[PDB]
Design an enzyme around this catalytic site. Structure first.
Site, PDB file in Angstrom:
ATOM      1  N   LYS A   8      12.047   4.260  -0.237  1.00  0.00           N
ATOM      2  CA  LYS A   8      12.188   3.746  -1.592  1.00  0.00           C
ATOM      3  C   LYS A   8      10.931   2.988  -2.004  1.00  0.00           C
ATOM      4  CE  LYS A   8      17.209   3.188  -1.190  1.00  0.00           C
ATOM      5  NZ  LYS A   8      18.267   2.173  -0.919  1.00  0.00           N
ATOM      6  N   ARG A 169      19.236   7.659 -14.119  1.00  0.00           N
ATOM      7  CA  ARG A 169      18.693   8.385 -12.981  1.00  0.00           C
ATOM      8  C   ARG A 169      18.290   9.813 -13.325  1.00  0.00           C
ATOM      9  NH1 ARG A 169      21.214   8.131  -7.101  1.00  0.00           N
ATOM     10  NH2 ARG A 169      20.011   6.193  -7.375  1.00  0.00           N
ATOM     11  N   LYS A 266      19.910  -2.185  -4.680  1.00  0.00           N
ATOM     12  CA  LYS A 266      20.280  -2.675  -5.997  1.00  0.00           C
ATOM     13  C   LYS A 266      21.375  -3.725  -5.869  1.00  0.00           C
ATOM     14  CE  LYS A 266      19.022   1.599  -8.396  1.00  0.00           C
ATOM     15  NZ  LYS A 266      18.580   2.316  -7.170  1.00  0.00           N
TER      16      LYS A 266
END
Length: 286
Positions: A8, A169, A266
């Protein structure tokens, strides 16, 4: 055999559009919604992460304890979406030989509250499905088991809506090729969903009603919202031994466009931010 792996990164707003094109050059977008005609909000993803007064789940995920669960209710698209996914992520340390898992089942928004409180039984949830001889038997049992295990800890550990994670997304992948799968999350946002404040933001239900998918949710108190500065890029690879990942991906991942932040979350970020006062443990990225 082959090796899987994922990373990520953070992407500054200035580099998004550039990055996005480089990806599209090799990886067309995954539509995934080929059935209901195109909608703007069809790219939205909202998830209500559950946890208790002690933030048991938070710390579990933070430390990544063996078996540490994350519980969230997720819906794809706008507020006219009826199907609600009850998802549970279960981390499993490598020394177990097993690997972390994500599982979910679908509920109609109608029965969400009733299920979380125990007034709606696993039996009822899937009675509608058992009636259809379509789904394989042992496959229904697993869904029932999962639904039970969730309703269980949801009550025993006294869980409640704590933090919301919203973002748009976009996914990318060349059909029939899994060597590389990318996803880019934009306008990422975390908003409080708890009541550790006297304030009943949910008013006795699984999600705030004063908001929906209306980013950037300006009607929210600054104290209740965290507009995330960057977009989130996740590259998921799969390589046969002796082979390499596509040279462009390696090149892109090592460029100035991205900023690696592995194991970024998140959920963990939202809690550590919005509820900083009551957390005694914090992630590395701050």
């Amino acid at each position: 055999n082959f090796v899987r792996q994922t990373t990520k990164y953070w992407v500054h707003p200035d580099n998004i559009t550039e990055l996005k094109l480089i990806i599209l050059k090799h990886l067309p977008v995954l539509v995934f919604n080929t059935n209901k005609e195109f909608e703007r909000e069809d790219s939205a993803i909202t998830s209500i992460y559950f946890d208790n007064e002690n933030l048991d789940l938070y710390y579990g995920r933070l430390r990544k304890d063996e078996g540490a669960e994350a519980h969230r209710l997720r819906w794809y698209g706008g507020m006219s979406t009826d199907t609600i996914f009850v998802e549970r992520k279960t981390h499993r340390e490598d020394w177990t030989g097993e690997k972390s898992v994500k599982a979910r089942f679908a509920l109609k928004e109608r029965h969400v509250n009733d299920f979380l409180k125990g007034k709606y039984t696993v039996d009822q949830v899937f009675a509608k499905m058992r009636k259809e001889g379509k789904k394989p038997m042992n496959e229904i049992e697993n869904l029932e088991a999962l639904a039970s295990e969730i309703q269980y800890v949801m009550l025993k550990k006294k869980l409640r809506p704590v933090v919301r994670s919203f973002y748009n997304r976009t996914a990318f992948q060349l059909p029939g090729d899994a060597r590389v799968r990318i996803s880019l999350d934009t306008e990422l946002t975390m908003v409080r969903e708890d009541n550790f404040d006297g304030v009943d933001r949910t008013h006795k239900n699984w999600r705030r009603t004063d908001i929906g998918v209306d980013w950037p949710f300006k009607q929210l108190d600054d104290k209740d919202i965290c507009r995330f500065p960057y977009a989130v890029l996740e590259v998921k690879l799969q390589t046969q031994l002796g082979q390499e990942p596509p040279e462009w991906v390696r090149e892109l991942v090592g460029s100035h466009l991205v900023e690696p932040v592995p194991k970024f979350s998140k959920f963990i970020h939202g809690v550590a931010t919005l509820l900083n006062d009551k957390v005694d443990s914090i992630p590395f990225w701050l």
